[PDB]
Amino acid sequence: APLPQLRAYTVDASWLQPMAPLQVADHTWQIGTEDLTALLVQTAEGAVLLDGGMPQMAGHLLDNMKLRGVAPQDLRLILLSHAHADHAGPVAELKRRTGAHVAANAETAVLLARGGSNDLHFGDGITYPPASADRIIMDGEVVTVGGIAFTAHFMPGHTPGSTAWTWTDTRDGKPVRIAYADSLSAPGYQLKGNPRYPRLIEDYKRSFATVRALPCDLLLTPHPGASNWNYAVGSKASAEALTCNAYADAAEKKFDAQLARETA
Amino acid sequence: APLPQLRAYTVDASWLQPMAPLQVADHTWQIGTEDLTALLVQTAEGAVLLDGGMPQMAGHLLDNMKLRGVAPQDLRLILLSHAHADHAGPVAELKRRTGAHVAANAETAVLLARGGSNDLHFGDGITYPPASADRIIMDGEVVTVGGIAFTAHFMPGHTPGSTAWTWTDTRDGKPVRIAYADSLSAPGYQLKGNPRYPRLIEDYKRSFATVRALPCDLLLTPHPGASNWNYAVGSKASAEALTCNAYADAAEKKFDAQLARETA
Amino acid sequence: APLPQLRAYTVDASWLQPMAPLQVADHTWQIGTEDLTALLVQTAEGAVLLDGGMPQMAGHLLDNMKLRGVAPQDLRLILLSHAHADHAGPVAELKRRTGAHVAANAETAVLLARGGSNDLHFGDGITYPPASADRIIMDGEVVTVGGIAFTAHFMPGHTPGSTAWTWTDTRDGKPVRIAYADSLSAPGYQLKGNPRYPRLIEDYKRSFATVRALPCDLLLTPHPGASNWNYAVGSKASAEALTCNAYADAAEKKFDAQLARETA
Amino acid sequence: APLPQLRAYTVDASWLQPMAPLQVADHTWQIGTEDLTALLVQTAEGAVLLDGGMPQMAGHLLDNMKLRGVAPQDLRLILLSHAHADHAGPVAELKRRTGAHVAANAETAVLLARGGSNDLHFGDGITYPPASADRIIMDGEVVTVGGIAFTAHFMPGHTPGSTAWTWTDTRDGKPVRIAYADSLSAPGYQLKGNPRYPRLIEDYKRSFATVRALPCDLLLTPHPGASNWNYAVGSKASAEALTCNAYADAAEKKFDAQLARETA
Numbered sequence A, B, C, D: 001a002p003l004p005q006l007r008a009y010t011v012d013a014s015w016l017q018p019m020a021p022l023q024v025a026d027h028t029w030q031i032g033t034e035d036l037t038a039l040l041v042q043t044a045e046g047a048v049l050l051d052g053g054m055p056q057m058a059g060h061l062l063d064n065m066k067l068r069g070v071a072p073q074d075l076r077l078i079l080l081s082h083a084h085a086d087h088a089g090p091v092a093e094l095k096r097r098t099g100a101h102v103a104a105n106a107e108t109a110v111l112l113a114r115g116g117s118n119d120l121h122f123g124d125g126i127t128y129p130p131a132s133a134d135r136i137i138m139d140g141e142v143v144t145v146g147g148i149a150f151t152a153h154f155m156p157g158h159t160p161g162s163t164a165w166t167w168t169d170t171r172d173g174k175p176v177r178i179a180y181a182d183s184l185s186a187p188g189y190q191l192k193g194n195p196r197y198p199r200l201i202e203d204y205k206r207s208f209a210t211v212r213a214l215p216c217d218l219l220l221t222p223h224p225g226a227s228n229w230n231y232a233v234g235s236k237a238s239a240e241a242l243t244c245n246a247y248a249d250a251a252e253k254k255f256d257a258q259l260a261r262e263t264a
């Protein structure tokens, strides 16, 4: 009886369904797929990319950046929510083909440095090509590119380096405060007494309060369904979107019920 | 039409067929599978592991080390031939569970650091968990562990960091010079005018002469069939084994014919 | 007028005054200098080193380990308080000459990876040879070596990766709870509105409460004077030592006065 | 008697004497100091920097790039000769403040990754802030930026990753072939039987032949005096400059005499 074969990381087909650039604000564009968020922010001095999706999406992101008139050498910075393969997949290839830098916190940098291997909950099952972080950022730090200020807010939980990014854009000249909050889920995580993450419950709870207090007029999440975004219906995508309170309060109820069912 | 799914790195079943420790010399043991070489060298001050095989072989290697009376903390050093997933797969997990160090040259270290991603010929198709090299070694350098001296011989070709290791063991008190030479194949490689490896032909040719001149009374290769080793027949495994000249001369004939067919 | 010359990191002479192993508990030994703490813990399966001091102390640490009958290959693990040159200096050389692994959190790992360069407060003025962390640890995680359990407690402040280590030893068979807390000082730090560390005050305050609640019957600090340890007087070294409450309460009073004087 | 203090890396004052941009060709500019070469190549799609000099020269390089009308975000690539502190010093700071990428071979990347520590000949005496290489290049590989092609030529000797860069510029429309060859010196190196570099003599000899055959109409070196460049006299700087043959033949005579005196 031979040893088992390696198994690839397969996802839903909608996660890999490419879409054209859907506009969020005057400078913010969704250029990922129907079920994976990849945000582009075009400024006067360059573009900024927030997350990238699956590893095989690198070419699709570049095609959509070309549609927005953004050349590869115009991408200045890559920001991340958390360093899992379904969000930070193409980061390594994007750095090679765009000449961009990656800014992330220490926890996301070390997870990105080993390509998602030795995950606290997933082990080596979800692995992507590794990449290095060029700039380490702290909680509440401000990253400015082309006059647009990106503020990081640590929200540990899904990964130890989970980060929410908030910035202020315009919509026909009216200022809108966009908050890109990371996921607050724990799919199959051992919450109680996890040796690889002893203070996991304290971090999740403290992150729920963090998401509630985010300066936010419009919320987006790495998975659009988590905040009731529907990238497929085009104009009416943000119709039934959730608030920061509604998103954090719904996520905490799921966390407590899962925590209660774990004690069984 | 969605983007294609990720595909895993599947191999022949014999590459994953575990085997018990087959003895090579007084201190050298094969503890891998039937078609993947993993050499253990037990010394008075600790053990040395040469290659590890597929990524899912980490547990099998530890079980065989236990059969030889080698505890995890007794593995002192990990040496490599080249940093591909079918040879350096479990290196990252082995470092975590054994407290061992990895010695490799600059070219193998950087390929091991990115887990085989961005391969010169394979791209991101064959990816394994990344690991870091603790000690960088040069061509002709001597690594000593427990009185046994391991000499490295650079043989660039299959990978830029392909390394042959030679050491002198005993067999019932009689000194035997064991040479562990890396593969000299180029499966699907573009040999002529490869932009990622311009001087590839010069390196292959120079490596053929290197393998011929290795101090060698017994030759082993990462794939046992490359030197006509048959780990399955136990005692008669080294019966029809090849010499250093026979192995290099057969590999060069295949390289030239492939090079001639490439010009077509 | 030429550009200014590089200036080395010079310290007090007592920081570099070697001392013989002074015993703390049945298994805990101070093997550093008179004004720099380097703790050795000898277990049945190997030794553990906590901090190392200045970069030029690597040879002195090895000599003292030899006096305790600890061979270089017997050092299994290196633990750190924070990755500054006066505490993590010889870590890179120690890893080369002992075959030991380093366990630290993400923030200490990335600072250790760049050798103290690009410090949040010191820039590139205090730089030491870089080293890599082999195992990343989380807050409250337990590291066990030879039956002795080391519990990490994150106390961000002096550096973002400042860590206190607590373990339970014996003293003539009587269990003693030793806590090795990191420094709580801010020599020349901008506390209010520091762009490289926006939430610095929140981390310092939260760390003061962390140090107070440490399970501790005997406290040691990277600088022995910070807890009124006097390694020079031998037996009477722990005579006037401070408690966890006394150490945290004295450090907070200095932090608030410095914070009040900063607002001037 | 306390342990000795750390000593900084002090150099000649002329190595730190800033100079204004002296023009080499239509697109090539020397923007370093009087005795340290730092070459800037302005193209239509961005600038390229070859070497940077001492670590404290980062601000001077940026000032000279501003004089050439090159903004920090316009520096696309950093190329190196070898990763010593007097040539790759400011690379880490330049990457932070310019958003540029670094391309170097495996041997230079690993030396740059540890900031010059654990040098084969210098140990930890010459240490600079570490930086990471974004793109690994092979011997004879071509790097193109803005239509200007940079060809790498490995010349191991001074360091294992010593690289000569050759490109073709214009001078009033007339094509000039510029070769930037690395140093061929061995100041205090043990040449014969060096355990850290066993095949050092073979690499030096093979590199002498490499420098002779470089396509070169104008030669520059990291230290301008090595090729009889005098950056101080402005226009007449390249007056008494050496050829590729003259530079390699003079360096080999010094190597053989030093090798003969070493055998004494």
Ligand SMILES: CO[C@@]1(NC(=O)[C@@H](C)C(=O)O)C(=O)N2C(C(=O)O)=C(C)CO[C@@H]21
Pocket: A084, A085, A086, A122, A126, A158, A183, A184, A185, A187, A188, A222, A223
């Ligand atoms: C590693 O990627 C994830 N997990 C998986 O794909 C497998 C392992 C699974 O358990 O379903 C992960 O985390 N995601 C999230 C998230 O909320 O971030 C959700 C909702 C589920 O999908 C991705």
Ligand SMILES: CO[C@@]1(NC(=O)[C@@H](C)C(=O)O)C(=O)N2C(C(=O)O)=C(C)CO[C@@H]21
Pocket: B084, B085, B086, B122, B126, B158, B183, B184, B185, B187, B188, B222, B223
């Ligand atoms: C990356 O692993 C290898 N390649 C593959 O598995 C695929 C990609 C394939 O082309 O067959 C690779 O190289 N090997 C060698 C070797 O000689 O080293 C041989 C003989 C073929 O198998 C492994």
Ligand SMILES: CO[C@@]1(NC(=O)[C@@H](C)C(=O)O)C(=O)N2C(C(=O)O)=C(C)CO[C@@H]21
Pocket: C084, C085, C086, C122, C126, C158, C183, C184, C185, C187, C188, C222, C223
């Ligand atoms: C980087 O090393 C330190 N700082 C210096 O040496 C210079 C920069 C200085 O400002 O005096 C640092 O932090 N230490 C601590 C500590 O409490 O950790 C104390 C008390 C002061 O000494 C070391």
Ligand SMILES: CO[C@@]1(NC(=O)[C@@H](C)C(=O)O)C(=O)N2C(C(=O)O)=C(C)CO[C@@H]21
Pocket: D084, D085, D086, D122, D126, D158, D183, D184, D185, D187, D188, D222, D223
């Ligand atoms: C590490 O920097 C160097 N060495 C020193 O500065 C000290 C250590 C010294 O031995 O003089 C080094 O190599 N250089 C070269 C070169 O040719 O590259 C020359 C000519 C001498 O200066 C620099």
Ligand SMILES: [Zn+2]
Pocket: A082, A084, A086, A158
């Ligand atoms: Zn995820």
Ligand SMILES: [Zn+2]
Pocket: A084, A086, A087, A183, A222, A223
């Ligand atoms: Zn996800």
Ligand SMILES: [Zn+2]
Pocket: B082, B084, B086, B158
């Ligand atoms: Zn291979």
Ligand SMILES: [Zn+2]
Pocket: B084, B086, B087, B183, B222, B223
């Ligand atoms: Zn193979």
Ligand SMILES: [Zn+2]
Pocket: C082, C084, C086, C158
């Ligand atoms: Zn400090």
Ligand SMILES: [Zn+2]
Pocket: C084, C086, C087, C183, C222, C223
């Ligand atoms: Zn200190």
Ligand SMILES: [Zn+2]
Pocket: D082, D084, D086, D158
């Ligand atoms: Zn040099």
Ligand SMILES: [Zn+2]
Pocket: D084, D086, D087, D183, D222, D223
């Ligand atoms: Zn030099």
